[PDB]
From Swiss-Prot:
Gene3D superfamilies: Alpha carbonic anhydrase. Changing N63H: Enhanced proton transfer. PROSITE patterns: ALPHA_CA_1, ALPHA_CA_2. It comes from Homo sapiens. Changing E102D: Normal CO(2) hydrase activity. Changing V138H: Impaired activity. Signal peptide: none annotated. Substrate binds at T194, T195. Its cofactor is Zn(2+); Co(2+). Changing L193F: Normal activity. The gene is CA2. This is Carbonic anhydrase 2. Interacts with SLC4A4. Interaction with SLC4A7 regulates SLC4A7 transporter activity. Interacts with SLC26A6 isoform 4 (via C-terminus cytoplasmic domain). Its main location: cytoplasm.
Length: 255
C-alpha cells in the first residue's frame, strides 16, 4: 500500500476491506451541522514529563516515538473516559500548500496535519488497544503556512538524518507542548486510523485552532523519501487520505 497511483487510497479496500467501513477517517468537518455539546469536558493534556526516544522514517511518514511504559505524557478529559498514553506523533503534508491535511473544515484543506497517537492505558499495551472501539485517541492539529514554529525546528533539523525508509535517529528531550495551539477547543467523532490496517478504534479530537509553520519548515518535510536507500527516489509528498463518508455519525463541538 502507498500513496501512488497504483497503490493509493483508492486501492486499500482490496487489502483492507474495512476501508469501506462504517466509521472510517478522515472526514469533512461541517461547522454548521457540527453539534455544540455542553456535556463536553475541557481537554486535559499533560506532557510535562514526556520522554522522546527516536524519530523514524517508516516509508509512509516519519514518527517521533515516546516512552509509554509509564503515564509520562497522557491525554484525558474531553470526550474521553480514562487515561490515554502518547506513543508517537507524525504528520501528513502535501506537494503544495493548498493540500496536505486529512480532515477538512467546511471543505477547506490545510498544508499539513499533526496526529498525536494515544492508547487507553485499561488495555495494557497498544496492540490490545487496537482491538477496542475506544482503544485509541488521536489528537489532530492543523498546520498552515505563516510564521515559523520555533518549537518545531528541532524536528526539522533531524530529517536529513532519516531521509529514507528504515532510517531512525536518537531523538530525546523533545517537548511536544511546543506543537500545541493556544486554544484547546475541539471537535470529536468516532473514526479510525487514516492509514492501514485502518482499524476503527479512534476517538478523534481535531482542535479548532491551527498552528502556523514557515514555508521553509514545510519545505524540509517535502525533501523526505518514501523509498529506501539505493532505490529510485520517490519524494514523500501527499501522504494523506481523502475524507470519507460520515455515514450517520455525528460531529460534536466543545464550543
Ligand atoms: Hg477497534
Ligand atoms: Zn496520521
Amino acid at each position: 500500500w502507498g500513496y501512488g497511483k497504483h497503490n493509493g487510497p483508492e486501492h486499500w479496500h482490496k487489502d483492507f476491506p474495512i476501508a469501506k467501513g462504517e466509521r472510517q477517517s478522515p472526514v469533512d468537518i461541517d461547522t454548521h451541522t457540527a453539534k455544540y455539546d455542553p456535556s463536553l469536558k475541557p481537554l486535559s493534556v499533560s506532557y510535562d514529563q514526556a520522554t522522546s526516544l527516536r524519530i523514524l522514517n517508516n516509508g509512509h511518514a516519519f514518527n517521533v516515538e515516546f516512552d509509554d511504559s509509564q503515564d509520562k505524557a497522557v491525554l484525558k478529559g474531553g470526550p474521553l473516559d480514562g487515561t490515554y498514553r502518547l506513543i508517537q506523533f507524525h504528520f501528513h503534508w502535501g506537494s503544495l500548500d493548498g493540500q496536505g491535511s486529512e480532515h477538512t473544515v467546511d471543505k477547506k484543506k490545510y498544508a499539513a496535519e499533526l496526529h498525536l497517537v494515544h492508547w487507553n492505558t485499561k488495555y495494557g499495551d497498544f496492540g490490545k488497544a487496537v482491538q477496542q472501539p475506544d482503544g485509541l485517541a488521536v489528537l489532530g492539529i492543523f498546520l498552515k503556512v505563516g510564521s515559523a514554529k520555533p518549537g518545531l525546528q528541532k524536528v526539522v533539523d533531524v530529517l536529513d538524518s532519516i531521509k529514507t525508509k528504515g532510517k531512525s535517529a536518537d531523538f530525546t528531550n523533545f517537548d511536544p507542548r511546543g506543537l500545541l495551539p493556544e486554544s484547546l477547543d475541539y471537535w470529536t467523532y468516532p473514526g479510525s486510523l487514516t492509514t492501514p490496517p485502518l482499524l476503527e478504534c479512534v476517538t478523534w479530537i481535531v482542535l479548532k485552532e491551527p498552528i502556523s509553520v514557515s514555508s521553509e519548515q514545510v519545505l524540509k518535510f517535502r525533501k523526505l523519501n518514501f523509498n529506501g536507500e539505493g532505490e529510485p527516489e520517490e519524494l514523500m509528498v501527499d501522504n494523506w487520505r481523502p475524507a470519507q463518508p460520515l455515514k450517520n455519525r455525528q460531529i460534536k463541538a466543545s464550543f
